[PDB]
Amino acid sequence: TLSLQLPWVEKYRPQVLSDIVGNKETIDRLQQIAKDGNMPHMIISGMPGIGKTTSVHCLAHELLGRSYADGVLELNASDDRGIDVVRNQIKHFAQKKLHLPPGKHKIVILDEADSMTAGAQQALRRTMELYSNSTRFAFACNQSNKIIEPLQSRCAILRYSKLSDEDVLKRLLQIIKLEDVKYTNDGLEAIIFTAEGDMRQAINNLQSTVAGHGLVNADNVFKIVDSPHPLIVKKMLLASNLEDSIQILRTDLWKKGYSSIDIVTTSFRVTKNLAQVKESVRLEMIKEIGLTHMRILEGVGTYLQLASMLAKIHKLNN
Amino acid sequence: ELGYDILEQNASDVRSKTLLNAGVKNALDNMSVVGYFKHNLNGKHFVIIMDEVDGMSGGDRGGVGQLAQFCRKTSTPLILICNERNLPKMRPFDRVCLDIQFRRPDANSIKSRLMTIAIREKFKLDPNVIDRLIQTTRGDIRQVINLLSTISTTTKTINHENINEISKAWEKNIALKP
Amino acid sequence: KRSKENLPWVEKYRPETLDEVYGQNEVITTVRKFVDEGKLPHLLFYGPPGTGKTSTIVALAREIYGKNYSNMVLELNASDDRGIDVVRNQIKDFASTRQIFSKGFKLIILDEADAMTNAAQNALRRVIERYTKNTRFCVLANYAHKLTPALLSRCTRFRFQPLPQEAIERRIANVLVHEKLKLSPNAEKALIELSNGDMRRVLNVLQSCKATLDNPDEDEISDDVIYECCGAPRPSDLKAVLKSILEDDWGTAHYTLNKVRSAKGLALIDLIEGIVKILEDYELQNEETRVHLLTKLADIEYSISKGGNDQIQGSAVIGAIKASFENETV
Amino acid sequence: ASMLEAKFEEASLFKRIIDGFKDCVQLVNFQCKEDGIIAQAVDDSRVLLVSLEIGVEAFQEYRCDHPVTLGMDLTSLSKILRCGNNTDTLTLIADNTPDSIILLFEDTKKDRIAEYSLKLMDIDADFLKIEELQYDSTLSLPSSEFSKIVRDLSQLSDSINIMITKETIKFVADGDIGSGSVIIKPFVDMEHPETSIKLEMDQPVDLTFGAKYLLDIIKGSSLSDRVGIRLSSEAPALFQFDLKSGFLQFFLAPKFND
Amino acid sequence: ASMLEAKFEEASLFKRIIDGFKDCVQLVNFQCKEDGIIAQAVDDSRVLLVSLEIGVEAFQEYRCDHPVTLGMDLTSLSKILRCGNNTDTLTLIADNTPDSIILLFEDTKKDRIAEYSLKLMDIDADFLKIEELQYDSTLSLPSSEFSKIVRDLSQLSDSINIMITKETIKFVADGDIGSGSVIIKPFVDMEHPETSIKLEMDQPVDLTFGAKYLLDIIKGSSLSDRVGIRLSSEAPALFQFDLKSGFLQFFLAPKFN
DNA sequence: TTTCGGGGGGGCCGGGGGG
DNA sequence: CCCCCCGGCCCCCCCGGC
Numbered sequence A: 001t002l003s004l005q006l007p008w009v010e011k012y013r014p015q016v017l018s019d020i021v022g023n024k025e026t027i028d029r030l031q032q033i034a035k036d037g038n039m040p041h042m043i044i045s046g047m048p049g050i051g052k053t054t055s056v057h058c059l060a061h062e063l064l065g066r067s068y069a070d071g072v073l074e075l076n077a078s079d080d081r082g083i084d085v086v087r088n089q090i091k092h093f094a095q096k097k098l099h100l101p102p103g104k105h106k107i108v109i110l111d112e113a114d115s116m117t118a119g120a121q122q123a124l125r126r127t128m129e130l131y132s133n134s135t136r137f138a139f140a141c142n143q144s145n146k147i148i149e150p151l152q153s154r155c156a157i158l159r160y161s162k163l164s165d166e167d168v169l170k171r172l173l174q175i176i177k178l179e180d181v182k183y184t185n186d187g188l189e190a191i192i193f194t195a196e197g198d199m200r201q202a203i204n205n206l207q208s209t210v211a212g213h214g215l216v217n218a219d220n221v222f223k224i225v226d227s228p229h230p231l232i233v234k235k236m237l238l239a240s241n242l243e244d245s246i247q248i249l250r251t252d253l254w255k256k257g258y259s260s261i262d263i264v265t266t267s268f269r270v271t272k273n274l275a276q277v278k279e280s281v282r283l284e285m286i287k288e289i290g291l292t293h294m295r296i297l298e299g300v301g302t303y304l305q306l307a308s309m310l311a312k313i314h315k316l317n318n
Numbered sequence B: 001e002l003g004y005d006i007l008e009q010n011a012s013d014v015r016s017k018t019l020l021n022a023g024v025k026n027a028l029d030n031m032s033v034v035g036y037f038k039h040n041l042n043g044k045h046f047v048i049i050m051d052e053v054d055g056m057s058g059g060d061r062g063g064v065g066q067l068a069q070f071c072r073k074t075s076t077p078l079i080l081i082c083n084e085r086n087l088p089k090m091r092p093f094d095r096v097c098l099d100i101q102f103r104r105p106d107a108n109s110i111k112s113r114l115m116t117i118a119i120r121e122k123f124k125l126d127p128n129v130i131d132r133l134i135q136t137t138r139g140d141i142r143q144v145i146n147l148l149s150t151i152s153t154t155t156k157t158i159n160h161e162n163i164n165e166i167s168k169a170w171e172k173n174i175a176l177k178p
Numbered sequence C: 001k002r003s004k005e006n007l008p009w010v011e012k013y014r015p016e017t018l019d020e021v022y023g024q025n026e027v028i029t030t031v032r033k034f035v036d037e038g039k040l041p042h043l044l045f046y047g048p049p050g051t052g053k054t055s056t057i058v059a060l061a062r063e064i065y066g067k068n069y070s071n072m073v074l075e076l077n078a079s080d081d082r083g084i085d086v087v088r089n090q091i092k093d094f095a096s097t098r099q100i101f102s103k104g105f106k107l108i109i110l111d112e113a114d115a116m117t118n119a120a121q122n123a124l125r126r127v128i129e130r131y132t133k134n135t136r137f138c139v140l141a142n143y144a145h146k147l148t149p150a151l152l153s154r155c156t157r158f159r160f161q162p163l164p165q166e167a168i169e170r171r172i173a174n175v176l177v178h179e180k181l182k183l184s185p186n187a188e189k190a191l192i193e194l195s196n197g198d199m200r201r202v203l204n205v206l207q208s209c210k211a212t213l214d215n216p217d218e219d220e221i222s223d224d225v226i227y228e229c230c231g232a233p234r235p236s237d238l239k240a241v242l243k244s245i246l247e248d249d250w251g252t253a254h255y256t257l258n259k260v261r262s263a264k265g266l267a268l269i270d271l272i273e274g275i276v277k278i279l280e281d282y283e284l285q286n287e288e289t290r291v292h293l294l295t296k297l298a299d300i301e302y303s304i305s306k307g308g309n310d311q312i313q314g315s316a317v318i319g320a321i322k323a324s325f326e327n328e329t330v
Numbered sequence D: 001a002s003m004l005e006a007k008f009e010e011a012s013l014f015k016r017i018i019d020g021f022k023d024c025v026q027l028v029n030f031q032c033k034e035d036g037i038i039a040q041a042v043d044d045s046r047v048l049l050v051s052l053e054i055g056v057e058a059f060q061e062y063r064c065d066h067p068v069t070l071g072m073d074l075t076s077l078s079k080i081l082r083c084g085n086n087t088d089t090l091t092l093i094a095d096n097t098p099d100s101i102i103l104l105f106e107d108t109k110k111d112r113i114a115e116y117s118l119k120l121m122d123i124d125a126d127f128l129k130i131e132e133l134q135y136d137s138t139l140s141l142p143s144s145e146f147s148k149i150v151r152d153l154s155q156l157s158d159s160i161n162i163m164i165t166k167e168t169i170k171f172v173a174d175g176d177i178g179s180g181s182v183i184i185k186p187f188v189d190m191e192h193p194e195t196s197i198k199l200e201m202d203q204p205v206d207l208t209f210g211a212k213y214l215l216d217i218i219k220g221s222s223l224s225d226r227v228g229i230r231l232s233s234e235a236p237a238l239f240q241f242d243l244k245s246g247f248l249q250f251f252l253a254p255k256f257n258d
Numbered sequence E: 001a002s003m004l005e006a007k008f009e010e011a012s013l014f015k016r017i018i019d020g021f022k023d024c025v026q027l028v029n030f031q032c033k034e035d036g037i038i039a040q041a042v043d044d045s046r047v048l049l050v051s052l053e054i055g056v057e058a059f060q061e062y063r064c065d066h067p068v069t070l071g072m073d074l075t076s077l078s079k080i081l082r083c084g085n086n087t088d089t090l091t092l093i094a095d096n097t098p099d100s101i102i103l104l105f106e107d108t109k110k111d112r113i114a115e116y117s118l119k120l121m122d123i124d125a126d127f128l129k130i131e132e133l134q135y136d137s138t139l140s141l142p143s144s145e146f147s148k149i150v151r152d153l154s155q156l157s158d159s160i161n162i163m164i165t166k167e168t169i170k171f172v173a174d175g176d177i178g179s180g181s182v183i184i185k186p187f188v189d190m191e192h193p194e195t196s197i198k199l200e201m202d203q204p205v206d207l208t209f210g211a212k213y214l215l216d217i218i219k220g221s222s223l224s225d226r227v228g229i230r231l232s233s234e235a236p237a238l239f240q241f242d243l244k245s246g247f248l249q250f251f252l253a254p255k256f257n
Numbered sequence F: 001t002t003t004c005g006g007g008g009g010g011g012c013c014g015g016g017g018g019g
Numbered sequence G: 001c002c003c004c005c006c007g008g009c010c011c012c013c014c015c016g017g018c
Ligand SMILES: Nc1ncnc2c1ncn2[C@@H]1O[C@H](COP(=O)(O)OP(=O)(O)OP(O)(O)=S)[C@@H](O)[C@H]1O
Pocket: A008, A009, A010, A012, A013, A014, A019, A020, A021, A022, A046, A047, A048, A049, A050, A051, A052, A053, A054, A055, A141, A142, A171, A199, A200, A203, C125, C150, C153
């Protein structure tokens, strides 16, 4: 078959600010800005798949209307964004003459701005300062720390928070109603649990489950979406007896095809984020895990090394 | 104020060694045509402002050393602006220019300005929380004004009720020094 | 390249259709259903070496486009340049343009994407998003930690498990039929055991075994042939060595280890692995015995990986096992 | 040096043919048979297909006992070709099951001989027969005019949109700094037939193409003074340049309408 | 597409005029009135001023209801202009409150029309008033000679010194590698007046200028066969190239003594 | 400080085209 | 025959985890 079905992430991508879930206060602020205009330079930061690009595009559309094509300059990591681009194309766009209503400005949308080089960011400073009367800049990024301090000083900070399970369930229910998808409460709970606050991941998993099995229930959802291995690693590290930890390692991780490097890196991360355990114990476990990680990187990526790491961790915990 | 003609350069312009030699180098000892056609006794002389001097990258082709050499024979006033004076790139400027430090302004010096802005924009600001806002911005006045502009769009009263949330949301995460 | 009979068995038996991929029934069924109704999403295939990921994606492309699939897909791997410039120009142009031959959608196969740079992966995000209406992406990986979370967020994940024993048996039967070979049940069991779920190992060992037989037509591949060609210890040798270590005194254990190793020139690392596998099933009253065994044997394995004195390493193995098992009394 | 032996009276012809598409593709499989030489290649992006055909009449002497496939790299072939002069005859020589191809430049008047050898490469790119397609529009125009239009419009934007409607051909580009539009109409002159603009229309068409691909395609204007463009809504655009005993064809896929 | 309609019967003239001062200024404000078109621009270094004037006699059909100001990025304008031939007529069309202007290249013999749109720029540069001044030295010489002298001298140093004394013109360059000099005297030939070097000196003059600015100025030599240099004691030098119904002027500020 | 590899930006050099 | 535009090496400078 040479035909494609449009992904539901694109088909049901919000087109207005009112269709975005989560971060209610920021969405209301953006709605007020759209109503009144005078949009300032802004930096929107947050975790993947929470509606940052969607928010920026919706704000630009509501602000500009018919003028969107002329008054919006969009650049992302897939386009050329070197110092020359900033110095020529962005400057030309900023200096461009464009008659707009008495409360609107041209918009430059720099998506994934955290990937831009230091030189381009430095060149953007006086460009933003001088042409603010007619042009405004909207950065979208995952890590606001990558944006240099002078640019942060020039922009309004908007830190997006993770989506609660309630909002994900609400959006999934809207999509299900619009698509007439047969489902069960347990299946939706499994999808939400596996998504971990990633709306895009949740929608993709729902669409894949519907396509592959039809009915959205726990069995089909877990068949399509594998249980995250970090939870398995956490269970392995928290086991009371060495035999149980070895059992988990051999059955749920090693026999499923997970590589030793992945297992050791996930163990390091989980141990780092193990608040239930005393910090000094966590540091000793990290020392052992690092020894094992160095051994694996050298080339000895065997099940015996991971078993020895588990044995040392249990000896420390005892 | 002193009736000079300003020739400003910044990071948005090419300031390599070749461009510097073929650019502002000729302006060190050159009369300003605008000054002549706008006739103060100093209006015919340039004041070369090199802003964002730390924004140029390059050990030798960047032109930092070339700017340092220019600083030793300029026939007109030359003012350089940078954010990090102690960076290795700034070594050529060790003992060739008069160094002037601009410290983070205290809350009192800007409380009057903040109150003026608050009343003019017709939103209420509590003077007892202003210092906290400064602590949020680490003395960045532009950031403080931006914070007020963005918050006032929906919340027309600023006081101890919501000071904590506003400060936490807009906290400036600056990388610490060694 | 005069004929397909000149190719190594690992490549001469490469599946050409989705019906020739074994041990991945769930993934094959799901992808077949996706393609049948035109609901193919962006795909990720994560799995260990030699499980059938490249074979599966190539078979899927051939099924979608037919024999002339190479000209209608953009395939990139670790042997080709995949920098940020490549993503910006070549991948973008392929994704944004129509097919030359047909009017169908376009497929981009990023094999071994775990070797891609972070900048290229980041650049791929909006490329995947913008052109999803007419283009689909497939990613293949052995190590998931090398893939950025943004890329993983946009793909549907399929895990290729280590090949089950039944699938290996069926493929061995097909290969035996094609090659006109005979294999004993014990030889098949040993081959499956040493495979560790990798088909390439099975095929290479089978080719070596065929090369070993004096008369490949009349002769049958026995477990002895497999052990000789692979130069691996027999289960009886491992059992004897372990029994001597556990029961006999130091002199007798040393003599037995040396004699067993010198009989067929076995490697110490293979003996250590076999003994570890045997001891895994042992029921130990004290966990400290298991702790000592694992730690000391892992240390010895790491030391062997860098060379060193072989006799001292063997004595170390003997002493480690004896000391660890001394903790089962009190 | 007997299996395949082909002769070009002037080496400039083969050099110009190679330069016509050397910037589009890098690896090409030349198939030589008793009826002449053919070649088909696809660029790395898989957006452009180049198809070259050279008949026997283009050669002073041509002999090919059995069909032979020769895989070559374009830059190496061009580097070897540029050695020869414009007054020297060229000879391509290949043996049975060859691992290399020999290029011989001869200058009888000066008794000058120059031999070069190029190692062949194994390319598993089978010749894909391009089934003939009926096109909505077929327009033949001077090569220089098309090259000028492409070079002018490519500066404004990275995409060029071609519209064919009743007695009119329009080339449009829209970019950051502005837009450009060129309108041409059919016109025939008996005094200067080489400058005529010929258009045959069945259905109107409107297709967008990448500017870089058109810039590469126009490099074949040297081979022929006229270019024929065949356009259909359901088929890729075909740009053909006619040689004395052959042709060079570029099949370019249009951009997705979205 | 009604207010401003300005026609050049060859597109080559406008392209040449733009190329005359393209390398010294980037953003230019073209003010078009009933009388004609004027443009005043200041280079980045703020030491060179370019003044272009084009009269209505230079247009096949010029019409402008009310004065209009157009912001031009010379790079984009030149890129647009290079798409047209000399034999074709070039028409500039500008409407009310224009965000862009239209350039139309038309071929009379053929039926080919090329329409381009150029986006205008927001330029807030102030306009400087140039009052007439009585220079103490005024010379006229062939443009090719001045261009050759400037190019030869610029190869040595970044500064050129010009001395005007009784029936003597001197151009000197002093650099690190070496120095060079060139001396000319007024001369007039009736058979070839176009090479007649003329000088009118009221008082002796001596002024230094930058090499890059002179190299930019001489790029307009193609516009006019002759070039006029006016120098005063302590005022910028004026380099003039005359057009059929217009002029191009470069006011260059000298280096302080 | 720095043991590869990738990315970016700037400087010349030289082929080709135009006058 | 000489000058200018513009593609390609050559070099040098800077991250490298999440
Ligand atoms: N708050 C949301 N409400 C509704 N849909 C959402 C929301 N967030 C994400 N989605 C859905 O997921 C798709 C992608 O959302 P995006 O805006 O691209 O997330 P993102 O944070 O910009 O991703 P990154 O940071 O570039 S990895 C949208 O088209 C929506 O269909």
